[PDB]
Design a protein around this ligand. Structure first.
Ligand code: HEM
Ligand code: HEM
Ligand code: HEM
Ligand code: HEM
Lengths: 141, 146, 141, 146
């Protein structure tokens, strides 16, 4: 469960991401597809080449849902109900993949935000991405 | 795939008593009932809304038979699982887009079906040898993903 | 989340287990140590020989805790609180291991309860062991 | 280690620039803070109640250097990781009782550490090659478990 300082750590780190959210989400996707090619099985309709507009577009979407989760950190299951339904009843992504995307987002943030990615903030981002993932797979069966 | 001769004998001995058609149907059907997310790949199979609909669905039964037949053929080539399944691996990746994690779920469901059919005879040591075999098959089916 | 049908299914199945729980718990452990040897790293102080008494004894305790969870299926997080603290603060067992014990319990039940281990019940039981594992693992960080 | 020439080259060049003392200390420190359960093996190191304590703990720093040193030497044996880490695998299993799943965690923390230090230079292709090496090392360290 996210503690107060965790929420504080996440709001601040995400705060600094700012207008670069979309770019980072796309980068994290690209890192995931290259590092973990099994994740590509979920996107056979996408052009997966470097810098493709589908990845960019999707990167923005993910990044925006994350902003919404940070803004709604105290009430995630409710702010994400529609995405949770979407992943459970339509997309049906195996849960292991959420850990691969979460790791790639961390690597992306660590790379863009050196001063801000302290040991304690790393800890908090990891718990946050983990909670978001739990929320997104909670209606699976 | 480090199998010892006594593991290999245990696996082969038991498999000789398996009706692949029937076990194939039980395993595929249980996969779809216990891990409903795996139904994403079989929408052309019709009604999968309840357990009886899945278990008695003739298309599930026919596909189960096909899956387990390929698996049997692999038990006859334990020393070259990768070569044996190479073309199937490519197929599952490039044409069917199946996340290989699903092969691990089926493996474990199959082990529950084997225990269910054989009771006592599926001892801890026999199960351990089958766990190595299902992991080996899953690894071989994932080997050509790119 | 367990559904009404799931609860019914678990109570019926566990009821058939009855006064065998202990014995089935020990068997699930033996199965786990032999199929997934990395799990032994958590029991370096035990004698892990076939028929070992520490194994039997520990089997009974695991089984008693599952029985208690079935008896309080509508209040599991509280019924298992003590165990959750234990696993988080002292034992610190990596979560993947819970999935491995759960599979071996399922295998053990399938081997001894042929008539009851129908598809629907297998499904409800797998969900039940997953909820128990989530509770035991909920306070890790 | 199905590493590509362009991938072996990517790993090696980046590594030539790594301060092993700093990175080892930071990776082992981050591991204990991000995944507190891992503190179970390090009770004798002192105070690990807070991130500042963990990161400053001189035994944590020193153990990090030793771990990353063994890792370095493995990067020169990429064609035979298993052979290189065999003894270390036996010791992690027989004396230290470390669940190999912890090796994967350290691997990922390490990768985050490399990105944190190298920024732009730690590009997607470079990361992918490092993920292959870190899984490779984890698998060789787990190989002699019984
Ligand atoms: C932090 C975790 C994740 C979040 C926040 C997230 C969020 C989203 C969002 C916002 C959408 C778009 C929904 C819309 O169109 O309105 C989406 C769709 C989708 N997501 Fe998830 N996602 C996550 C993880 C994953 C992972 C792990 C996978 C599998 C690798 C995945 C696969 C997909 C797919 C295939 C789509 C549909 C893409 C399309 O057809 O355009 N997602 N997700
Ligand atoms: C033991 C592992 C498996 C083996 C040996 C296996 C084998 C096969 C074989 C022989 C075919 C027919 C190939 C063809 O049409 O040319 C097939 C097709 C297929 N497999 Fe796999 N399979 C396995 C696991 C799985 C799993 C776990 C899934 C998904 C959860 C899956 C999804 C499919 C799908 C969707 C088809 C095509 C069905 C159709 O004709 O519409 N397979 N498999
Ligand atoms: C279904 C999931 C599990 C349940 C219900 C369960 C239940 C219990 C219980 C009742 C105890 C005894 C605590 C006491 O003496 O009061 C215990 C202890 C213990 N458990 Fe868990 N356990 C589960 C899974 C695991 C797994 C996955 C592991 C690691 C492989 C594990 C490792 C241990 C260890 C090492 C002890 C201490 C044993 C001793 O020193 O005597 N448990 N558990
Ligand atoms: C990158 C993977 C790892 C490598 C290459 C590695 C390597 C080493 C080496 C070379 C030693 C020194 C042994 C000696 O002096 O004979 C050591 C000790 C040790 N390692 Fe590992 N290690 C790794 C990961 C881990 C992790 C993940 C854990 C647990 C979280 C761990 C726990 C320990 C412990 C408890 C010792 C003994 C420390 C002491 O002297 O008190 N190691 N390791």
């Amino acid at each position: 469960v996210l503690s107060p300082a965790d929420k504080t750590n996440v709001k601040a780190a995400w705060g600094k991401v700012g207008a670069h959210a979309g770019e980072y989400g796309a980068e994290a996707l690209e890192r995931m597809f290259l590092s973990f090619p099994t994740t590509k099985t979920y996107f056979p309709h996408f052009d997966l080449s470097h810098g493709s507009a589908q990845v960019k577009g999707h990167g923005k979407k993910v990044a925006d849902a994350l902003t919404n989760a940070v803004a709604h950190v105290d009430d995630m299951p409710n702010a994400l109900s529609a995405l949770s339904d979407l992943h459970a009843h339509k997309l049906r992504v195996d849960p292991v993949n959420f850990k691969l995307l979460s790791h790639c987002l961390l690597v992306t943030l660590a790379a863009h935000l050196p001063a801000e990615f302290t040991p304690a903030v790393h800890a908090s981002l990891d718990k946050f991405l983990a909670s978001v993932s739990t929320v997104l797979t909670s209606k699976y069966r | 795939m480090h199998l010892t001769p006594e593991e290999k004998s245990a696996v082969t001995a038991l498999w000789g008593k398996v009706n692949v058609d029937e076990v194939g149907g039980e395993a595929l059907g249980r996969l779809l009932v216990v891990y409903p997310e795996t139904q994403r790949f079989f929408e052309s199979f019709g009604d999968l809304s309840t357990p009886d609909a899945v278990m008695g669905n003739p298309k599930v039964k026919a596909h189960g038979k096909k899956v387990l037949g390929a698996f049997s053929d692999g038990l006859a080539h334990l020393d070259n699982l990768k070569g044996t399944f190479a073309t199937l691996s490519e197929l599952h990746c490039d044409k069917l887009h199946v996340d290989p994690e699903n092969f691990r779920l089926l493996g474990n469901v199959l082990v529950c079906v084997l225990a269910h059919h054989f009771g006592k005879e599926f001892t801890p040591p026999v199960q351990a040898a089958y766990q190595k075999v299902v992991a080996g098959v899953a690894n071989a089916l994932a080997h050509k993903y790119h």
